[PDB]
Write an enzyme that holds these catalytic residues in place. Structure first.
Site, PDB file in Angstrom:
ATOM      1  CD  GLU A 156      -9.425  -2.912   4.016  1.00 42.01           C
ATOM      2  OE1 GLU A 156      -9.501  -2.400   5.442  1.00 42.01           O
ATOM      3  OE2 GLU A 156      -9.225  -1.556   3.294  1.00 42.01           O
TER       4      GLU A 156
ATOM      5  NE  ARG B  41     -11.160  11.742   3.285  1.00 45.01           N
ATOM      6  CZ  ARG B  41     -10.628  10.462   3.175  1.00 45.01           C
ATOM      7  NH1 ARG B  41     -11.779   9.931   3.689  1.00 45.01           N
ATOM      8  NH2 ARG B  41      -9.461  10.367   2.428  1.00 45.01           N
TER       9      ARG B  41
ATOM     10  NE  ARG C   8      -5.341  -1.678   0.103  1.00 46.09           N
ATOM     11  CZ  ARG C   8      -6.089  -1.548   1.204  1.00 46.09           C
ATOM     12  NH1 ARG C   8      -6.435  -1.654   2.231  1.00 46.09           N
ATOM     13  NH2 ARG C   8      -7.444  -1.671   1.048  1.00 46.09           N
TER      14      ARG C   8
ATOM     15  CG  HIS D  72     -13.776   1.788   3.241  1.00 47.16           C
ATOM     16  ND1 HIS D  72     -14.630   2.825   3.585  1.00 47.16           N
ATOM     17  CD2 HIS D  72     -11.969   2.488   3.034  1.00 47.16           C
ATOM     18  CE1 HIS D  72     -13.654   4.093   3.906  1.00 47.16           C
ATOM     19  NE2 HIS D  72     -12.384   3.269   3.367  1.00 47.16           N
TER      20      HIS D  72
ATOM     21  CG  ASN E  89      -2.342   1.477   1.156  1.00 48.20           C
ATOM     22  OD1 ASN E  89      -1.556   1.743   0.240  1.00 48.20           O
ATOM     23  ND2 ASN E  89      -3.201   1.168   1.889  1.00 48.20           N
TER      24      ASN E  89
END
Lengths: 379, 381
Positions: free
Chosen positions: A365, A222, A72, A161, A8
């Site tokens: 994940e 956010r 990823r 996601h 990642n």
């Protein structure tokens, strides 16, 4: 025994994990940080560091049964949605998507180029965070804006996601000992980013993030949902530029914008000592999440199960309680003895008589991506 | 009998009605269009109101013998400053001018309507009623956006809400239709017209509503997008080279039902669907999915819900829209009855089955009457 190295690659950091897809054991996990006066100047030295770190825990990639490298990528747009074996021409093609995700997509391409040089004798696979939602029904994918303009520039609800939502839905089915194809369910991924999804069988029906990861739930930094008129209004009054507004909504909003704190565990303490700004941020967070739950109950019509997951979801008892309280007439009943702090593994948190079941289901994940690599390379 | 003249003053047109607040009887109704056009005998707002006096004379109103006691003016945005029905004077008007960045297109022509009317009818009181008023009181968790706090406070950025006059009035008529006090009821109201919005209400206090800082947010509308990722603005600047102000105009004037299908009137939409047009079916399904979500969201906000009501132009007449909005919701307490839902009847009426845990109504809105009753009340008797 075989293994997959999962990468990642972000702009200032790099995460890695070496994992066996059959047992689910992680041999080694780590992160390279701060890619100004740093011992890691570029992305090449970063992957070299990860190698030194793996060696240090007794790993050697020539002896470890390595069969793939998994990478990823946040945004696959409208054209990349299945796991994809990489070559020269697929990589050139990926550069066209940087328009949709300018902060996140370019450092992943950097990570791919380096990995391919230093490890040329092994297959490399890309996996896309948008991919699970590519088949959204058109009623949910299409925004209500000018058709021609939307189709020209590929504007739609993409969703994110995806790896987490698909994994949890499969594990919830196994916990209940029922076929996944006959289930309807809601999943709530609560971490540094937050999203919800609604799922029928193997196909998603709706999700809370949109064109970009900004839309939906309230998050750490956010805003989530807001009238798009704020952009224009801030230009004409504050003399703020468009790039300034977008940046304020991504990095200087959510919980931190309301209370000054990002770290969710500090927020409870400040509430108990009578800090008014902290109490307001928590109740703004809670109110938005309650709405998404009720909206997805109506979309589904009948709902078998609801599951909480990720860092906040798997661990914060107060949050789960405040999310669904006062909803007994909708079919949800929580059990306080079972919702206790400090528990472990997949588990039931609802009352035995609750018409709708409620679970905690931990996410993985990296394990889901490793299984995706092996499948695509021929089982 | 006493009477009130109610005025809606837009940029190109002006609407009016002379109504009795006790009986509800409207003695005259009309509209003056094409203001400012070269063809038109109506060059400005002074001439339009004078035209309106002549039509009243045409309809048989002797203005000097009609028992007129007030002029009611409607205004879209009151900010955090004006929320109650307010007696107008020159000081109040100065404070109103300062709010025009919150509503650059709708507020200015309403001020022009006020200034013309005070000059032509100087011996009658004039009252303003704000479309934002009912929602001034939202609980802080529903009113506050999750953005930089100092920033939001300096420029007065919050969820304001709109269609306030209609949501309140319908909530009162629902309580009256059922023989129950308003203070004990929890209810949802769906205002579906050219503009579209939803509210969640506990007794006399609104808990949430679908429009936001401006009327752009929430449901899918005739020409407006409703909810969308604010990132569109940024994205369209960088790739299509569009300016902020042109995006805003597209989102308000070329989106919605019209943006997806080319069509305005919902009666035209139905004929296109039954004849098999693919773009029309899509527009309508996007509209329906968004509405189903707001109904579910507000059932969770309320916890327990007593009644749901449809209103305005589409809500009052279109039986297919009602069916599509609440079917498949039996596990949430909603059971619709096909025979009571049929087109034909007007007036307040039940459309749910007799044994539905939640009651469902159609309740016609009458915004001009609501505004006239507010004028009389603030003038002390």
């Amino acid at each position: 025994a075989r293994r997959v190295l999962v990468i990642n690659s972000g702009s200032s950091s790099l995460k890695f994990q070496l994992v066996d897809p059959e047992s689910g054991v992680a041999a080694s996990t780590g992160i390279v940080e701060r890619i100004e006066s740093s011992p890691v100047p570029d992305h090449d030295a970063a992957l070299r560091r990860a190698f030194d770190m793996l060696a240090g825990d007794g790993v050697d990639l020539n002896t470890a049964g390595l069969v793939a490298v998994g990478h990823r990528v946040v945004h696959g747009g409208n054209t990349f949605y299945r796991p994809t074996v990489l070559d020269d021409a697929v990589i050139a093609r990926l550069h066209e998507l940087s328009e949709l995700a300018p902060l996140h997509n370019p450092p992943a391409l950097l990570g791919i180029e380096v990995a391919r040089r230093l490890l040329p004798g092994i297959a490399h696979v890309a996996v896309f965070d948008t991919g699970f939602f590519h088949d959204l029904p058109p009623a949910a994918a299409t925004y209500a804006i000018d058709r021609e303009l939307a189709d020209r520039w590929q504007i739609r609800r993409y969703g994110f996601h995806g790896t987490s939502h698909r994994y949890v839905s499969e594990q919830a089915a196994a916990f209940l000992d029922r076929p996944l194809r006959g289930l309807k369910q809601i999943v709530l991924h609560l971490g540094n980013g937050c999203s919800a999804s609604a799922i029928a069988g193997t196909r998603p029906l709706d999700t809370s993030m949109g064109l970009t990861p900004l839309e939906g739930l309230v998050m750490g930094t956010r805003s989530g949902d807001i009238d798009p008129s704020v952009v224009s209004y801030l230009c004409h009054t504050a003399g703020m530029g468009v790039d300034d507004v977008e940046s304020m909504l991504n990095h200087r909003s959510g919980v931190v914008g309301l209370s000054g704190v990002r770290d969710f565990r500090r927020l409870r303490e400040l509430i108990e000592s009578g800090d008014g700004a902290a109490q307001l941020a928590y109740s703004v967070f809670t109110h938005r999440l309650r709405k998404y739950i009720g909206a997805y109950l109506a979309v589904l019509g009948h709902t078998d199960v609801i599951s909480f997951t990720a860092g906040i979801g798997e661990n914060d008892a107060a949050v789960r309680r405040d999310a669904v309280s006062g909803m007994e007439e909708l079919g949800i009943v929580l059990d306080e003895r079972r919702n206790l702090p400090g528990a472990k593994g997949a588990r039931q948190i609802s009352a035995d008589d609750s018409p709708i079941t409620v679970l905690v289901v931990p996410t993985n994940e990296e394990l889901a991506i490793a299984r995706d690599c092996v499948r695509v390379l021929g089982g």
